[PDB]
């Protein structure tokens, strides 16, 4: 029954932005401002959560998987910069005036290179309307985002627009994640990774990451 | 039922503290080692709390309302400040290192006085291996607890003393409510409350919480 589940939250000052059917019976996973939420079909419980699936081998983080949902309608409003040959695919929360995300930009043809297709996702520190916020809100907007994005670390000025994008949108994801600073890198499965690294440690760090993570 | 929920806690490794209903169907509430989990009953499923009621007029924590079980368990551990016309009731997690915490001490007449009474159970902020932890260790096994209390938040011979009271099972209660920093207090409805706040302040507080809830 989302109407009363809604209308709880609402008495709560907590807004719905993702209502899914929980993995539990009357139970449906809700994403708030507030987190991810698990609360009865009659909106009168709410447990903080996360949930984790553990009929099985390991434990399945079911809020981390709630969150790769978003992460995943979001694809369509990544800037994506491919490796020819692609290796390793990682997202990455940048600030156009965070000088490391310079840094990782002036880098980005070593870090293809090196088969790493990075992913980019609008997280400005300051916050919604700063500066930063307006001037990304303009290039997620342009037509050719890679393009308009290039321009702006190059200085040159971006034609702006009035797109469907909402930076918010991956301010509050980002932050759902578990980001705070910029670039904040994080994985395939969900792992957040904070800082920026450089095109051959960040290969040397997503070779072993997988290996770890595969059982090789 | 209980043996597929016994079979998941095993699996990680966990002892059931004991088992209990939950207000929500098909899941039990489950006090363990690591502490309060909801898990269904099939044991496919757990959540982390803490639970809430939500379908009244304010949201009311059923994990703490739960604890409150444990909390009532430590009654006797407690260094109580029992006001003559008692009107209210709170328990306090206090640290005789805190600031804040001697100033509310020092001012408990007045809480009495407002018919209040307090309390105290120890939350060393520091972790187990502190003074923190240490010199109430010894606050809580003297003869005369309140006097030790009263001795050594005036600074005073911290008496050497021991018994079987651990600390940690405050600590841990505390942790499982909530508790972050001192002074943090606990509401009969299983409410936690961070902070300090006069006797005056405190009062109102106490009279509009419990007005705005039970109607």
Redesign the interface.
């Known amino acids: 029954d989302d109407a009363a589940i809604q209308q ?1 939250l609402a ?2 000052g907590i807004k719905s932005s993702d209502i899914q059917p929980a ?5 449906k996973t809700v994403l708030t401002n507030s987190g991810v939420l ?1 609360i ?1 079909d ?14 099985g081998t390991a ?1 399945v983080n ?1 809020t981390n998987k709630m969150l790769l949902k978003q992460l995943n309608a979001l694809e369509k409003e990544m800037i994506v910069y491919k490796a020819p040959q692609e290796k390793h695919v990682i997202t990455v929360f940048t600030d156009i005036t965070c000088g490391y995300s310079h840094k990782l930009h002036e880098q980005m043809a070593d870090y293809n290179a090196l088969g790493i297709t990075v992913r980019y996702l609008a997280f400005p520190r300051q916050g919604l309307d700063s500066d930063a916020e307006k001037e990304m809100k303009a290039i997620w907007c342009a037509k050719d985002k890679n393009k308009a994005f290039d321009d702006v670390m190059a200085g040159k000025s971006v034609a702006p627009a009035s797109c469907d994008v909402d930076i918010a949108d991956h301010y509050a994801l980002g932050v759902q994640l578990g980001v705070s600073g910029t670039p904040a890198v994080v994985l395939s499965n969900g792992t957040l990774v904070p800082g920026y690294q450089p095109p051959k440690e960040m290969k040397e760090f997503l070779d072993e990451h997988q290996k770890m993570t595969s059982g090789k």
Do not use: E, L, N
């Open positions: 709880t008495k709560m993995p539990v019976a009357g139970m698990y009865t009659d909106g009168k419980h709410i447990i903080q959560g996360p949930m984790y699936d553990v009929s434990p079911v």
